[PDB]
Enzyme design. Structure first.
Site, mmCIF file in Angstrom:
data_model
loop_
_atom_site.group_PDB
_atom_site.id
_atom_site.type_symbol
_atom_site.label_atom_id
_atom_site.label_comp_id
_atom_site.label_asym_id
_atom_site.label_seq_id
_atom_site.Cartn_x
_atom_site.Cartn_y
_atom_site.Cartn_z
ATOM 1 N N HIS A 88 0.949 6.171 -2.419
ATOM 2 C CA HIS A 88 1.459 4.806 -2.423
ATOM 3 C C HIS A 88 1.843 4.357 -3.825
ATOM 4 O O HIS A 88 2.548 3.352 -3.969
ATOM 5 C CB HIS A 88 0.436 3.852 -1.800
ATOM 6 C CG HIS A 88 -0.726 3.526 -2.687
ATOM 7 N ND1 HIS A 88 -1.943 4.161 -2.571
ATOM 8 C CD2 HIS A 88 -0.884 2.587 -3.649
ATOM 9 C CE1 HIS A 88 -2.787 3.657 -3.452
ATOM 10 N NE2 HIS A 88 -2.169 2.703 -4.122
ATOM 11 N N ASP B 100 -2.725 9.222 2.364
ATOM 12 C CA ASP B 100 -1.910 8.681 1.263
ATOM 13 C C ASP B 100 -1.986 9.560 0.011
ATOM 14 O O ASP B 100 -2.234 9.093 -1.099
ATOM 15 C CB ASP B 100 -2.309 7.227 0.959
ATOM 16 C CG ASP B 100 -1.324 6.509 0.046
ATOM 17 O OD1 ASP B 100 -0.133 6.388 0.401
ATOM 18 O OD2 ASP B 100 -1.752 6.111 -1.056
ATOM 19 N N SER C 166 -6.525 1.886 -9.247
ATOM 20 C CA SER C 166 -6.446 3.003 -8.308
ATOM 21 C C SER C 166 -6.035 4.261 -9.056
ATOM 22 O O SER C 166 -5.010 4.277 -9.739
ATOM 23 C CB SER C 166 -5.449 2.710 -7.191
ATOM 24 O OG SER C 166 -6.028 1.880 -6.204
#
Lengths: 151, 151
Positions: free
Chosen positions: B29, B51, B103
């Site tokens: 992502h 992902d 992240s």
């Protein structure tokens, strides 16, 4: 260093761009891009008549802008390299102080409010006379003395 | 800050990618391209369920890799912003320790072995329980608590 921002293009420092009010302004004749990608993607409009490039300031940077004023009293002003005389409708600089490459840097008042953008200067007066863009009766207008060279 | 590597998209950092074991790891992502040319050219495989974007570490980075372990006992673990509690099959952090951009930071144990990678988190009031992919019987698996936001 108050609002001046470096523009760099293919190895050469090619001027400065300034965000003031709702505009990002840059001289049209200096080719290339301001070295921050958030600015570099905007729709810029060219005017050959004023040799001016204008763009709408993005929202999250609106509060970074320099203040301005319509009021231009006679006197001394400030720029990056020192005092700038304004009299007779002419901004002037010490003869020989001039520096090709600095076109686009703002001229500001005693409160740091920008009144004009410099395009260049003419060497046959007494001092270097600047060609500049500024606002008169809220209309942007370019004042250029005869025989001025590009910086 | 021992084995942590960036990834940037249109001027803004977009999280981090990490070399772990013999793996180059990045959430799918995370949009954009890694601004280091050795990484951007590997063969990447996408997994939509997890992902995940995958690549084999090149030889010239092999000696830079972090050790890891499959065994994760209950206790406290470490990440760049502090402690991460693992207990009950749930990893949580103090609310505010994580924000958009984190992240990709690895989570590692007391022996410096990375055990998991953060994909995002669900605020549960005082603390935030992370959605993470990590290993079980040597197979990557996604654990997502309800209401998780990407970091």
């Amino acid at each position: 260093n108050d609002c001046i921002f470096e523009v760099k293009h293919e190895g050469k420092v090619m001027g400065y761009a300034c965000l003031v009010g709702d505009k990002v302004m840059k001289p049209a004749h200096v080719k290339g891009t301001i070295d921050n990608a958030d600015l570099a993607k905007l729709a810029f409009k060219r005017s050959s008549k004023y040799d001016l490039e204008c763009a709408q300031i993005p929202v999250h940077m609106k509060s970074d802008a320099s203040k301005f004023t319509h009021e231009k009293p006679e006197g001394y002003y400030n720029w990056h390299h020192g005092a700038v005389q304004y009299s007779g409708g002419r901004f002037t600089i010490p003869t020989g102080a001039g520096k090709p490459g600095d076109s686009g840097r703002p001229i500001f008042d005693n409160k740091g409010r920008v009144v004009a953008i410099v395009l260049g200067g003419a060497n046959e007066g007494a001092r270097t006379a600047l060609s500049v863009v500024t606002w008169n009766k809220d209309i942007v207008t370019k004042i250029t003395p005869e025989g001025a060279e590009e910086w």
